[PDB]
């Protein structure tokens, strides 16, 4: 009865304009996956470089001068 596909549905009429907000080139090889946290406070990416990097999604809103991986697991 409480079927939730997404913890945060896109805003009504959301049509992505394709405006680049943050360019992150920390990974040294191909990125294999992207995942978003259940609270939507963080998202993580993994790469063939052998590292998994966690990013603060709130920091990618442009309010911060430099957006880099919050944590690096290798």
């Amino acid at each position: 009865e409480n079927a939730e596909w997404e913890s945060k549905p896109p805003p009504p009429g959301w049509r992505p304009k394709g405006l680049l907000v943050a360019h992150l080139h920390e990974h040294k090889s191909a990125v294999n996956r992207i995942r978003v946290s259940d609270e939507h406070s963080l998202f993580a990416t993994c790469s063939n470089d052998g590292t998994v990097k966690i990013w603060n999604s709130q920091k990618m809103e442009g309010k911060t001068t430099t957006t880099r991986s919050i944590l690096t697991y290798s």
């Binding site: 680049l20 943050a22 360019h23 001068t65 430099t66």
Partner: protein
């Protein structure tokens, strides 16, 4: 009999699949080497353009103050551009600061294009050469 024929086809498939992977591995390595050469060419071509750009159009030399394009346009080495705020509140020093930022913006915009680096902030050189920017807009 049918299992033997399938087993024969599988033996062929294993050697066939092994060869396809080997060919791709060598081809990938070769394209990686060519890519390495391409990156070196791009780097050398960029370095030439950057040294030319900064040697003919936007000369950067330590004149303290640092000059850009020529010794006639200089910015304070400490980065304290309060002279612009002071002038807005008030050989005009404001023209020297505004000109340095204009040439700097043009250089940054050109450097971005030559280096193929998407800049984190969208800034046009006309912003520093247009109307006198408010303290907030200048900051």
């Amino acid at each position: 009999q049918k299992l033997y024929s399938r087993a024969q086809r599988h033996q062929e498939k294993k050697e066939k699949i092994q060869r396809h992977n080997r060919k791709l591995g060598d081809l990938v390595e070769k394209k990686t080497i060519d890519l390495r050469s391409h990156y070196e060419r791009l780097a050398n071509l960029r370095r030439s353009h950057i040294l030319e750009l900064t040697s003919v159009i936007f000369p950067i030399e330590e004149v303290t103050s640092i000059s850009i394009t020529g010794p006639w346009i200089s910015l304070p080495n400490n980065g304290d551009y309060s002279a612009y705020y002071s002038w807005v509140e008030e050989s005009n020093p404001a023209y020297t600061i505004s000109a340095a930022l204009c040439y700097a913006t043009q250089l940054v915009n050109i450097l971005s294009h030559i280096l193929d680096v998407n800049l984190p902030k969208k800034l046009c050189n006309s912003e520093f050469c247009g109307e006198n920017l408010s303290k907030q807009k200048f900051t």
